[PDB]
Design a protein around this ligand. Structure first.
Ligand SMILES: Nc1nc2c(ncn2[C@@H]2O[C@H](COP(=O)(O)OP(=O)(O)OP(=O)(O)O)[C@@H](O)[C@H]2O)c(=O)[nH]1
Ligand SMILES: Nc1nc2c(ncn2[C@@H]2O[C@H](COP(=O)(O)OP(=O)(O)OP(=O)(O)O)[C@@H](O)[C@H]2O)c(=O)[nH]1
Ligand SMILES: Nc1nc2c(ncn2[C@@H]2O[C@H](COP(=O)(O)OP(=O)(O)O)[C@@H](O)[C@H]2O)c(=O)[nH]1
Ligand SMILES: Nc1nc2c(ncn2[C@@H]2O[C@H](COP(=O)(O)OP(=O)(O)O)[C@@H](O)[C@H]2O)c(=O)[nH]1
Ligand SMILES: [Mg+2]
Ligand SMILES: [Mg+2]
Lengths: 6, 426, 439, 127, 43, 439, 426
């Protein structure tokens, strides 16, 4: 539902 | 619900098979790990068709990967989706095929067929309601053709009431990469007409014209060529996995497009194809898609549709649209080209529609075509067979492994018999 | 206490029932959940919903239809979609594999293994009804399940229930547009059942309802979800006499006596009027003397036939909404003075009139407009045999080359039934010519 | 381009339209779509019921405020729009004295209720 | 800008570094659209 | 109870009809939307709008107009204009590509596609009328669609509707100003229809209205938006006895008998009076005894002819507004005492009168002034022998060397029709001289 | 709703057409990006006539760009409005014609004719109602006049009843830039008389004198001459895309000005053409442009109207104006000039008035003339052809490519017949 990237 | 067993054999099939499972893992949102990451809940409702539930919610594909050389295994397991296949499904020997039909069917293939047939029995009874069989191989190879048609003969002795979905890469005239390829072609197609129900023929030369003209690719590598086959590959089983307005299963396509037990050789197609230069200039609309399907340039086999007659056509659609526009241009193209089709079969074209288009696209379609223009694909190999048989060239590799010379006679007899039936029913 | 039992078979019959059962919940003010809140008029009207909904004592209302499909991929969207809580969980009967567009699979091989579930749920439903009137079966002649699973069901429901009527609403192939390929076979093999074990089969096609939505409702691209809402209005117009009160009502036994003069001539038409969008309702006024002339014109017929070439045999007019019987009788005398409407010599009186006191109800978000009246016309005529001539033309040049035959005999049939079913419509078109001639 | 090949008879830019007095109309130009990537990629999955070709959006005057801009202008740019301009500003009031009617149909022919056979009953006042 | 450049190149593909620059622009377009997609999808 | 049907053909008829329907709505008080504001049954006069409008159940009013054209570039201006809501969306008939100044294109190739939809609305509109009296068809002689399409439109009404009048209003080619170059060819083909299927066809040219606008109306630059308002007042004066009650009322048949003396003489000339601006009306008094003398001025007639070269047959003067019936009587006696006004000896009486108490109402933004009374003259003269003589000389020179013939023979119309229609107009010129000579 | 196809052939016709697509995109408010940046909804009312709308509201032209030298297309795509075309419609070869008529019609164009008819068939069977074509070329070279008239002959055979609107730039005596130029026109007119609905004649000499005296332009380069032609190019079809008081399409214009099947060559013009200084000193009224309309200096060809007779005259006006002014101003001109106009055709003027002018001007008009002044141009070319042909000069290139000597004599017969037709009615 959310975003995460390195 | 309804489950499909996938068999992969040969060098050509094993590369396409990694590209098979590349597409529908993205369609169903399956990671290389095996965990489902997606956004819609419609993808999980039919996931047993292609994947098996395992421990910890990880899915493993129901595919059997067989090759007599471990070299092709080292490529598929080290690829993008190489870590998803089951470690026990990899069955391999140690001696290469050597592009011989004898090393795959009579001498070396006989020892490994018990190992192959045991794993599929562990997979067939793992399915709840088995639907059909999907095999992918190359007729011009040694272990794709020699061992691919051996599995057809053994399995059809076990499951008589099933359906066969084979996808064969046929030989090409100018891009001939084997000197023994006309031998391995005729010795495979002789058993293909007997113990199958539909044979989907694909050629390499016709896929180069699609990349050169429709896509305008500067470097048409094998990573993009096999992906273009994969779109038609996952379009034939669209309605077994997704809801639709008019669902069509594989036995429904079988009754529609098979008038006689030996007129069952088809062609494939993929409808929404555009280039990078003309992305902003073409319109993704059903009348524009419909004309694209009936292009002579958009067929995957090196036989022009105009020099033959279309017996029966099927068109599996995807995406959301009104039904009558699909029902109109599939009728207009029948009336405006009446000399192309035949006169004794009303309603040559079969229409099917789904509800979910693929990712990264608006709508989609899939072309499946029966025609009398498949004569030129089989006469062109028969002429290669007769010129080499009269000089007995390269026959010592075949008589030296345990086959008589008379076996070449019925193989040439049946292929002249097969194209006789196409011409008699013209 | 006047009940009806409806059976939806195949992909077509189930898909209409999604839009068919849309209307019956809306007419009686009943939610998709299955309850009735404060929409009830007390002191009466309890038999208006007792024709289609049965009242479970907890307050839930469960429908009285059976949905059968050998392919699980259609019922699974009903079981998970909008109406999961409405239907009873045992009225949704499914199989294992589809009929694959084949009459042989739907009637012998896989159509036999599930008929004991299908027939016994009918017996569990028919015991609840105090008064049983007949059957309202919805399927398609061109399908595999529709041709298959209706044929042996009618062979077995006609021995369990002898004298009960059988009203059929089927989808016939159109002259030009046709989706499947084996349709000249599955249409021919179904009709051997219908002449002996079916009393009155109402028949429609797809092409003649595409173009009705084109220039009447001004929608250029209709969809299957638009066709099924229009068919869902006619069946609720036919059933409307059991539900509500009127000047004079026409029930199930009434209009079969008025429309079946011979044991084998029982194939009528259907016509609904007025079919307009919301924008045309304000401009052109809707009168009793006008909506009845729309029914008799060849453009508004929902089957691709020319009524002018044929000769009418019997009719029935079923008016709803604010209708005065003086207006109808003046409108009928207009019809009899037209030379384009031709009747046979042996039928001097041919018009049967029923009136109801309920205006039509429109679905929210629909295409049709709010009309203060309605009319439905159920016409027996001799022009149906023209539509069956062109489908007979499809069979003869296809059977001459023995095409598509090995898919049939390999499942358990015999080839001899192909010649037997062809000679049946040789005698049937012989019958319509022998009857329609003047004496 | 070469300077010899360049000429200044007609240099047309990507035309930002001037203040509305300078245009032939009183209307500034439409801003349109500001992102070409959005215009290319964010198409519509849906289809409309009433338009037959998805190529031609404005098939039959679909969503065009032509008459609205005609009434926004004091006089139209079309000669065919002259006729209905000044209806909202009337000169003489209407004359309604000499108008035909149906007093025969209004007085003689009645609908129903048969007043002769029933007593006057409730709410009857002698005239 | 990458789209304007790519449509600004000519119709010939015969030259080797012309082909190289067309392929490099195509690869940049694919990576660019992948970037925009993985930004836009999650929100 | 009395009604008329209005059909508008070609660009000339339709754009005149845009001026007709704006005059009619202001006369009854109906907005262009179609809803009467506050005049429902109070001050209503439910027959006042009945000859031209149709009342709906909601309250909207629908005209009797059927706009038909072979171009979309004319009809789509009222679909987007002010009057999109007044008309019915099936009345607005739109083609795809024009006859394009060709009689044979609008009669033989293009027109036959659309007529079955034109007549189907004539049948639909005529059944709503209680009693039908006549048609109001507007066209022009010069063009291809205005000549080709209405020529075979009238022959279908002549064989379907027998005893109904057909009041046709035609724009005639002027002797000097002319737009098309094939106009002498089109009118020769047009008049074959008018001699058989027409009952009263009024002819009007463009050049005479130009001069009336120059010296009477005092307009420096006359416009096509001002010609059509003047034509629309005359057609509103012909049908004045149907909307309104007067001293002596003339319906459609009554002035048909006393204007048409022979079956081949049915081409009268219309004239309106007084046509003045608002500048000069203070300085000029208006009386009955002089507004009728303005009718017989040689410079006021709306057809470029010299009446002093011809002799009269019959006249009809339809007075409106505050007109005393004695003042007309003294005015007629003034006319026959004038030596220049010549009458045939076989018509001792020639003047038919008509009075109505409804004064004219000028539209806002118009140039016509407010007058107490106005008179409309319908004269059947012999002066139009010269108007047909000059056009026959136009056709004779172009046909002598076969000019513009290879387009007409390309559609299929055989060359003998040019000689067949030319000798008919030769027979039409001799019919005036057969009856115009005294006994 | 009503449609016309556009085609561009030859180097001269391509850049004129490239100026055309810049002109109408301004009147319809279309940016070079492809978006609609305009102010009126009357532009979008009939915009489909020349444009195909792509999805998302981007508009592309209906144009086919064909030549033999791909360097010309590189200039057009680098142009101001060159980014809107369709690269799938782009047809080009590899070997230039070298200004040879036999190369474009028989040697090179026979192998390219299959690819140019397949792309015009894509835009025409996606149409609703098709009126005709607009092909721009020149009669001076081997590329524009060789295969430019070949596309006319192929389409008219396969479309029997349509309209052809070609725009040929005519060779000139003084400004000849080709030494074989009379040989190009004589072979080109052989099919232009028979197979063409109408042809506009444009002369490079008359375009100079308009720019020299009426415009008083200092530098009349090729960028301004095409803009001078393109104003008349957009003026002929204002009755199709814009509402007007008196509507008349091209077939109405076709039947008005063509009395005989072989006389269909029109002399065009533009109306508000002035200098920079005298704009303050003039008056824009409809009687004023009529004196400007009939100026012999304003004609776009070096055919003196005072040396012949007028058959049929047309005038398409634009903007608002009183229609009685138009009828009197082109009736008085026939009365005060009677000997010049023909005597066996009365009412020589066709009137057309639209209600929207080109932008930046109050009102505008377009002149189309069909006069007998053209016969001096035809006898000019035929005389120069006669001197070259009797010496067997420059026949060495054509004859070795398949050309016979009988066709040049036949072409001279077809020219001299057409000269006799015009003087027959004088
Ligand atoms: N009008 C209409 N026809 C439908 C609809 N759904 C299915 N059909 C028709 O059903 C016909 C054939 O039946 P099928 O679509 O094969 O479905 P089926 O009857 O279950 O047949 P099988 O699945 O093979 O057993 C098609 O030609 C369709 O026209 C619908 O919703 N509306
Ligand atoms: N009174 C009046 N006459 C008009 C009007 N417009 C055109 N005309 C006349 O109509 C004549 C030609 O007919 P058109 O207007 O072209 O219409 P048509 O007869 O159907 O011919 P086409 O439409 O070209 O087929 C011209 O000579 C004009 O005099 C108008 O608005 N008012
Ligand atoms: N389309 C396609 N064809 C392939 C590919 N790999 C091999 N082939 C074809 O397979 C033929 C040789 O097959 P081969 O490797 O000898 O098969 P094997 O000996 O049975 O493993 C060649 O003619 C190729 O055209 C591939 O990735 N894609
Ligand atoms: N108006 C205009 N005319 C041109 C242009 N370029 C060349 N021409 C004309 O074209 C003629 C030569 O035609 P040519 O180029 O040989 O035709 P091609 O064979 O199709 O290329 C010359 O007489 C020039 O007047 C231009 O940019 N504009
Ligand atoms: Mg089904
Ligand atoms: Mg017109």
């Amino acid at each position: 539902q959310v975003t995460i990237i390195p | 619900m309804r489950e499909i067993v996938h068999l992969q054999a040969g060098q050509c099939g094993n590369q396409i098979g990694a590209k098979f499972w590349e597409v529908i893992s993205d369609e169903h949102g399956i990671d290389p790990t095996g965990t489902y990451h997606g956004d819609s809940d419609l993808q999980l409702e039919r996931i047993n068709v292609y994947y098996n539930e395992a421990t910890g919610g990880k899915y493993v594909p129901r595919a059997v990967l067989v090759d007599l050389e471990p070299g092709t295994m080292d490529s598929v397991r080290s690829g993008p989706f190489g870590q998803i296949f089951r470690p026990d499904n990899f069955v391999f020997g140690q001696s290469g095929a050597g592009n011989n039909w004898a090393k795959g069917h009579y001498t070396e293939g006989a020892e490994l067929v018990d190992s192959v047939l045991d794993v599929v029995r562990k997979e067939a009874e793992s399915c709840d309601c088995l639907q059909g069989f999907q095999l992918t191989h190359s007729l011009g190879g040694g272990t794709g053709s020699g061992m691919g048609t051996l599995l057809i003969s053994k399995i059809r002795e076990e499951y008589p009431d099933r359906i066969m979905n084979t996808f064969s890469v046929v030989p090409s005239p100018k891009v001939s990469d084997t000197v023994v390829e006309p031998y391995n072609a005729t010795l495979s197609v002789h058993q293909l007409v007997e113990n199958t129900d539909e044979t989907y023929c694909i050629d390499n030369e016709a896929l180069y014209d699609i990349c050169f003209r429709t896509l305008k690719l500067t470097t048409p590598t094998y990573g993009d060529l096999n992906h273009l086959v994969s779109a038609t590959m996952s379009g034939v089983t669209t309605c077994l996995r997704f809801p639709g307005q008019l669902n069509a299963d594989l036995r429904k396509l079988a009754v529609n497009m098979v008038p006689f037990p030996r007129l069952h050789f088809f062609m494939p197609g993929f409808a929404p194809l555009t280039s990078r230069g003309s992305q902003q200039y073409r319109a993704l609309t059903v009348p524009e898609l419909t004309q694209q399907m009936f292009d002579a340039k958009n067929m995957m086999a090196a036989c022009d549709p105009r020099h033959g007659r279309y017996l029966t056509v099927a068109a599996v659609f995807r995406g959301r649209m009104s039904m009558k526009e699909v029902d109109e241009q599939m009728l207009n193209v029948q009336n405006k080209n009446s000399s192309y089709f035949v006169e004794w079969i009303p309603n040559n074209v079969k229409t099917a529609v789904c509800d979910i288009p693929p990712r990264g696209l608006k709508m989609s379609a899939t072309f499946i075509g029966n025609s009398t223009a498949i004569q030129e694909l089989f006469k062109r190999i028969s002429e290669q067979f007769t010129a080499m048989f009269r000089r007995k060239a390269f026959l010592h590799w075949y008589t030296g492994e345990g086959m008589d010379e008379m076996e070449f006679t019925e193989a040439e007899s049946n292929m002249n018999d097969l194209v006789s039936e196409y011409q008699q029913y013209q | 206490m006047r009940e009806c039992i409806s059976i939806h078979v195949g992909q077509a019959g189930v898909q209409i029932g999604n839009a068919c059962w849309e209307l019956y919940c809306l007419e009686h003010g009943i939610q998709p959940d299955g309850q009735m809140p404060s929409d009830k008029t007390i002191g009466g009207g309890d038999d208006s919903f007792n024709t289609f909904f049965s009242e479970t004592g907890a307050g839930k209302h469960v429908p009285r239809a059976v949905f059968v499909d050998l392919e699980p991929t259609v019922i699974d969207e009903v079981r998970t979609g909008t109406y999961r809580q409405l239907f009873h969980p045992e009225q949704l009967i499914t199989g294992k594999e589809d009929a694959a567009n084949n009459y042989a699979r739907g009637h012998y091989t896989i159509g036999k293994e599930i008929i004991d579930l299908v027939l016994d749920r009918i017996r569990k439903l028919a015991d609840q009804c105090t008064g049983l009137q007949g059957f309202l079966v919805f399927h398609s002649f061109g399908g595999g399940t529709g041709s298959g699973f209706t044929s042996l069901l009618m062979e077995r429901l006609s021995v369990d229930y002898g004298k009960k009527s059988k009203l059929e609403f089927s989808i016939y192939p159109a002259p030009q547009v046709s989706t499947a390929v084996v349709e000249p076979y599955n249409s021919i093999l179904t009709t051997h059942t219908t002449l002996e074990h079916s009393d009155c089969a109402f028949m429609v096609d797809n092409e003649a309802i595409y173009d009705i939505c084109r220039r009447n409702l001004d929608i250029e691209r209709p969809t299957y979800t638009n066709l099924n809402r229009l068919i869902g209005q006619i069946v609720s117009s036919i059933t409307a006499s059991l539900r509500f009160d009127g000047a004079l009502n026409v029930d199930l036994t009434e209009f079969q006596t008025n429309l079946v003069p011979y044991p084998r001539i029982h194939f009528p038409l259907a016509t609904y009027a007025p079919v307009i969008s919301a924008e045309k309702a304000y401009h052109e006024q809707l009168s009793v003397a006008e909506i009845t002339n729309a029914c008799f014109e060849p453009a508004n017929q929902m089957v691709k036939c020319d009524p002018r070439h044929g000769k009418y045999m019997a009719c029935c007019l079923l008016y709803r909404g604010d209708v005065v019987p003086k207006d109808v009788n003046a409108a009928i005398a207009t019809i009899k003075t037209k030379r384009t409407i031709q009747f046979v010599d042996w039928c001097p009186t041919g018009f049967k009139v029923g009136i109801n006191y309920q205006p039509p109800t429109v679905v929210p978000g629909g295409d049709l407009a709010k009309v203060q009246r309605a009319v439905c016309m159920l016409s027996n005529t001799t022009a149906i045999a023209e539509a069956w001539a062109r489908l007979d033309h499809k069979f003869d040049l296809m059977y001459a080359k023995r095409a598509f035959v090995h898919w049939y005999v390999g499942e358990g049939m015999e080839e001899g039934e192909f010649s037997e079913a062809r000679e049946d419509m040789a005698a049937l078109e012989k019958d319509y010519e022998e009857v329609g001639v003047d004496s | 381009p070469p300077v010899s090949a360049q000429s200044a008879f007609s240099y047309i830019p990507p035309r930002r339209l001037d203040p509305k007095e300078h245009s032939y109309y009183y209307r500034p130009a439409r801003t349109g779509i500001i992102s070409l990537y959005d215009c290319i990629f964010k198409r519509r999955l849906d289809y409309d019921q009433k338009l037959h070709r998805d190529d031609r959006e404005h098939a039959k005057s679909l969503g065009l405020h032509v008459n609205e801009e005609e009434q926004e202008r004091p006089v139209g740019v079309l000669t065919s729009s002259v006729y209905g301009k000044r209806i909202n500003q009337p000169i003489e009031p209407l004359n309604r004295d000499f108008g035909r009617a149906n007093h025969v149909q209004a007085d003689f022919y009645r609908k129903n209720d048969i007043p002769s056979l029933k007593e006057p009953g409730f709410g009857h006042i002698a005239p | 800008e990458v789209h304007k450049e790519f449509q600004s190149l000519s119709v010939f593909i015969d030259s080797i570094p012309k082909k190289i620059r067309k392929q490099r622009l195509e690869e940049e377009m694919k990576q660019l659209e992948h970037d925009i997609g993985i930004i836009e999808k999650h929100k």
